[PDB]
Design a binder for this molecule. Structure first.
Ligand SMILES: C[S@@+](CC[C@H](N)C(=O)[O-])C[C@H]1O[C@@H](n2cnc3c(N)ncnc32)[C@H](O)[C@@H]1O
Ligand SMILES: Cc1cc(N)c(N)cc1Cl
Length: 256
C-alpha cells in the first residue's frame, strides 16, 4: 500500500468541517474576488474565466510547458487555459474541446487579449475524438472520486487517450491519481518515450493528489509522487494554515 493510498483513506475519514479546513491548508491561491464580480456583471476583458488561467500560468512562467503554434486544449471547460494561451507571443491558434451538458462547464465567450485565435467547442467527449496535429497539447481532465480505484481507472483512461496526440510537441497533462502502482507503470513507460516530468502545482488543493505531466523536465516519477504524498499527509497533522493569497492574472483585451 502506497503513501498516497494512506492519504486517501485519511481524506475520506474527514467530516465536512475537517475537509473544508484541510483542502486549502498551506496552499497557494489567487484572489478571484474582482474576476468573479466582473464576470457576474458580464465583463469580457481582463478577467480570467476560472482559476485555471493562473494554474497554467504557474507552469508557463517556469518554462515547464512553452505554448506555441497550434494549441489543443482537452477538457477546456470555461476556457481558462485557452484564453491564457491565446495571449502568448508564440501561440498562433487555440482549439478547446469540452463535454459541457449536465455536470460539466460550458465555454465562456471572452474578449481578453488574443480572443480571435481561440475556438472553444462544447459537446465534445475527448474519448471519442480522433487525434489532430498540434504543437502544444494541453489536457486538464480527471474527475476526483472518494474511490482511489475509480480515480486510477480515470487516470489510466486519460493517459491512454492523450498518447496518440503526443508527437514531439509541448504538453501539460493532468494526472488525477499519480500514486497507484498501475498509473506509475504507465507514467514510467510514457516518460521513457515522450520524456517530461511530473510536477505538483502549488495552486492545487490538498483534497487532490493531482500532478501534471509537463514536457520540459526530467526526474524520478516515483520520488516526485512520494514527496507529494508526504506533503499532503503532513498537512493533516497541524492546525489550518491560511492559503498564500496571490494576485489573479490580467488577460488584457484586444485582438492578435
Ligand atoms: C479541471 S476542468 C478544466 C478547467 C480549465 N483548464 C480552465 O482553465 O478553465 C476539466 C474539464 O474537463 C471537462 N471534461 C471532463 N471529462 C471530459 C471529456 N470526456 N471530454 C471533454 N471534456 C471533459 C469537464 O467538464 C471540466 O470542464
Ligand atoms: C444542467 C445543465 C448544464 C449545462 N452545462 C447544459 N448545457 C445544460 C444543462 Cl440542462
Amino acid at each position: 500500500e502506497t503513501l498516497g493510498e494512506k492519504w486517501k483513506k485519511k481524506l475520506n475519514q474527514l467530516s465536512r468541517k475537517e475537509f473544508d479546513l484541510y483542502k486549502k491548508s498551506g496552499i497557494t491561491e489567487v484572489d478571484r474576488t474582482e474576476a468573479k464580480e466582473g464576470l457576474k456583471r458580464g465583463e469580457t476583458t481582463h478577467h480570467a474565466v476560472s482559476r485555471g488561467s493562473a494554474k497554467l500560468q504557474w507552469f508557463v512562467e517556469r518554462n515547464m510547458v512553452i505554448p506555441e503554434g497550434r494549441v489543443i486544449d482537452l477538457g477546456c471547460g470555461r476556457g481558462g487555459w485557452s484564453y491564457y494561451c491565446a495571449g502568448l507571443k508564440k501561440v498562433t491558434e487555440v482549439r478547446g474541446y469540452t463535454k459541457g451538458g449536465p455536470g460539466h462547464e460550458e465555454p465562456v465567450p471572452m474578449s481578453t487579449y488574443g480572443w480571435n485565435i481561440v475556438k472553444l467547442m462544447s459537446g465534445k467527449d475527448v474519448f471519442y475524438l480522433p487525434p489532430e496535429k498540434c504543437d502544444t497539447l494541453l489536457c486538464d481532465i480527471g474527475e476526483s472520486s472518494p474511490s482511489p480505484t475509480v480515480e486510477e481507472s480515470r487516470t489510466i483512461r486519460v493517459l491512454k487517450m492523450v498518447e496518440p496526440w503526443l508527437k514531439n510537441n509541448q504538453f501539460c497533462i493532468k494526472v488525477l491519481n499519480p500514486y497507484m502502482p498501475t498509473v506509475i507503470e504507465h507514467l514510467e513507460r510514457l516518460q521513457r518515450k515522450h520524456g517530461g516530468m511530473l510536477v505538483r502545482n502549488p495552486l492545487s488543493r490538498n483534497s487532490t493528489h493531482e500532478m501534471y505531466w509537463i514536457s520540459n523536465g526530467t526526474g524520478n516519477i516515483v520520488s516526485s509522487v512520494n514527496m507529494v504524498s508526504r506533503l499532503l499527509l503532513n498537512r493533516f497533522t497541524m492546525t489550518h494554515r491560511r492559503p498564500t493569497i496571490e494576485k489573479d492574472v490580467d488577460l488584457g483585451a484586444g485582438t492578435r
